[PDB]
Amino acid sequence: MTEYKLVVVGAGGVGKSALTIQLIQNHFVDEYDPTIEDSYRKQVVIDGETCLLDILDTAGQEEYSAMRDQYMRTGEGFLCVFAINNTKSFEDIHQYREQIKRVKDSDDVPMVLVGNKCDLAARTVESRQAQDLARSYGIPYIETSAKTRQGVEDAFYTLVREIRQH
Ligand SMILES: Nc1nc2c(ncn2[C@@H]2O[C@H](COP(=O)(O)OP(=O)(O)O)[C@@H](O)[C@H]2O)c(=O)[nH]1
Ligand SMILES: [Mg+2]
Predict the structure, then answer these.
(1) Among 124, 127, 134, 150, which is disulfide-ready with 141 (CB 3.0 to 4.6 Å)?
(2) From the CA of 59, how far away is ligand 2's center (Å)?
(3) Which reaction is the catalytic activity of this chain?
(4) 56: domain CATH number?
(5) Which atom of ligand 1 is nearest to the CA of 11?
(6) How many distinct structural domains can be found in the chain?
(7) Is 83 annotated as a binding residue?
(8) H or E stretch including 97?
């Protein structure tokens, strides 16, 4: 049984928590108390090999924050969540994809830019924009929607596949 860390990072509201709890409790949550920071684990099987995945769903909390930075150095999988129907999450992934290079002090993490909130018609972020920003860094782009587990499997799976190959 291997152990991988899903270092999640994105805008506060894209649906990072609702995505984690979904794979765990299995239910759409509209308010999972944004004022809560804890590590959510999950034992599942990727492809004939069970592997404990310590999901790291950071929360809000302002002021001093040294535990979130320490996790950026310990975990390895980076699920850069970005709500396509928000736009601010996109600008949040631009800078969020620099501090990761700070912590590890290098540009070679199994990075993964996911676009949450892709189960609606209001598409403020066209796929061409996320394709020109993610493809530029050389990172895979996927879709996700906690409102129906749509894409949640393509993100978590492709994440363990990037850490294994590395
Ligand atoms: N339609 C839709 N709304 C979502 C989705 N994920 C989050 N939201 C909305 O965004 C808000 C924040 O969700 P939540 O996951 O609790 O916040 P987070 O912890 O910052 O991700 C909620 O009020 C939801 O209505 C999703 O997959 N689909
Ligand atoms: Mg939250």
Answers:
(1) 134
(2) 5
(3) GTP + H2O = GDP + phosphate + H(+)
(4) 3.40.50.300
(5) 20
(6) 1
(7) no
(8) helix 88-104
